């Protein structure tokens with residue numbers, strides 16, 4: 613996942629209930645790589661959003677076709693968010709990956725809602 | 732996890748293009764589909780040249796991809 617950027621050392625005295633102790637800590641700097649997550653998460657998330665757009669080129673008169681594409685497009689977006697969210701631990705704050713999928717959720721939902729008002 | 736794409740990914744990726752291109756192909760056919768009704772055993776939509784040609788290009792081109800893909804990787808030292 614990461615790349616070893618570099619290392620850094622320190623030396624400081626931590627105070628505790630049992631006395632003052634000299635502590636030495638080594639800091640390793642690790643920089644994430646998103647290549648896997650793009651193919652794993654973003655690229656499926658990007659491609660599914662495009663499936664919503666082709667709804668527009670499809671004829672409006674094809675009511676089952678548009679809804680079929682719309683409901684299939686949004687529903688699989690839900691699964692992608694969960695499995696993408698599954699990779700993360702249980703932390704109570706929205707992350708950047710969460711932000712991307714949610715915005716992609718808006719597009720697919722809006723695309724379905726676009727046909728709802730279109731009909 | 733690995734920061735590179737394996738030979739498995741390229742076949743899955745190219746297969747993704749073929750299946751995705753199939754959707755775009757129908758969308759293009761849908762654009763020129765003038766009439767909503769179908770043939771009855773008045774004018775009826777003739778079978779599009781896109782389909783009549785995609786019936787040949789897509790399998791023929793996909794087959795060529797398999798030859799290149801499998802020959803490349805199977806014979807590697």
Ligand SMILES: CCCCCCCC/C=C/CCCCCCCC(=O)O[C@@H](COC(=O)CCCCCCCCCCCCCCC)COP(=O)([O-])OCC[N+](C)(C)C
Nearest residue numbers: 778783785786787788789790791792793794795796797798
């Ligand atoms: C999947 C498992 C199930 C098997 C199913 C069993 C069936 C077996 C399949 C039999 C072939 C299917 C056609 C039978 C019907 C004849 C009519 C027809 O439609 O032919 C059409 C040609 O288009 C094709 O037939 C292309 C068929 C796919 C082969 C693509 C070539 C690459 C080979 C693939 C290998 C990878 C390549 C590797 C590289 C070497 C002509 O269209 P038409 O409307 O008839 O035209 C009107 C009359 N006319 C022709 C006089 C003008």
Ligand SMILES: CCCCCCCC(=O)OC[C@H](COP(=O)(O)O[C@@H]1[C@H](O)[C@H](O)[C@@H](OP(=O)(O)O)[C@H](OP(=O)(O)O)[C@H]1O)OC(=O)CCCCCCC
Nearest residue numbers: 752755756759760763765775776777778779780781784788
């Ligand atoms: C994957 C997408 C690739 C991009 C391809 C995108 C390129 C592209 O969009 O082509 C479609 C276009 C028209 O073909 P297409 O069959 O779809 O449309 C027909 C065309 O409009 C005729 O002119 C119409 O008759 P008319 O005169 O109006 O009366 C006919 O209506 P009808 O008579 O039945 O009532 C229509 O069906 O060109 C080609 O013919 C060969 C394309 C070869 C495509 C092969 C490429 C693989």
Ligand SMILES: CCCCCCCCCCCC
Nearest residue numbers: 690693694706711713714717
């Ligand atoms: C599966 C995700 C559903 C969409 C989440 C909507 C809540 C807002 C997220 C973005 C807040 C910045």
Ligand SMILES: CCCCCCCCCCCC
Nearest residue numbers: 651655656744747748751752
């Ligand atoms: C999920 C893996 C996808 C890999 C990248 C696919 C890119 C090609 C798709 C679009 C072709 C028209």
Ligand SMILES: CCCCCCCCCCCC
Nearest residue numbers: 745748749752789792795796
């Ligand atoms: C008919 C259009 C197919 C689109 C996907 C093709 C991409 C890979 C090229 C094949 C290499 C021989």
Ligand SMILES: CCCCCCCC
Nearest residue numbers: 725726727728729730
């Ligand atoms: C109230 C939810 C959206 C339903 C579609 C409304 C189109 C005007």
Ligand SMILES: CCCCCCCC
Nearest residue numbers: 666669755758759762
């Ligand atoms: C995703 C839309 C593909 C194009 C459909 C209309 C034909 C140019």
Ligand SMILES: CCCCCCCC
Nearest residue numbers: 790793794797798801
């Ligand atoms: C569709 C049949 C393909 C067989 C290729 C030969 C190797 C199994």
Ligand SMILES: CCCCCCCC
Nearest residue numbers: 794797798801802805
């Ligand atoms: C129909 C083409 C299949 C190719 C199989 C692999 C040959 C080395």
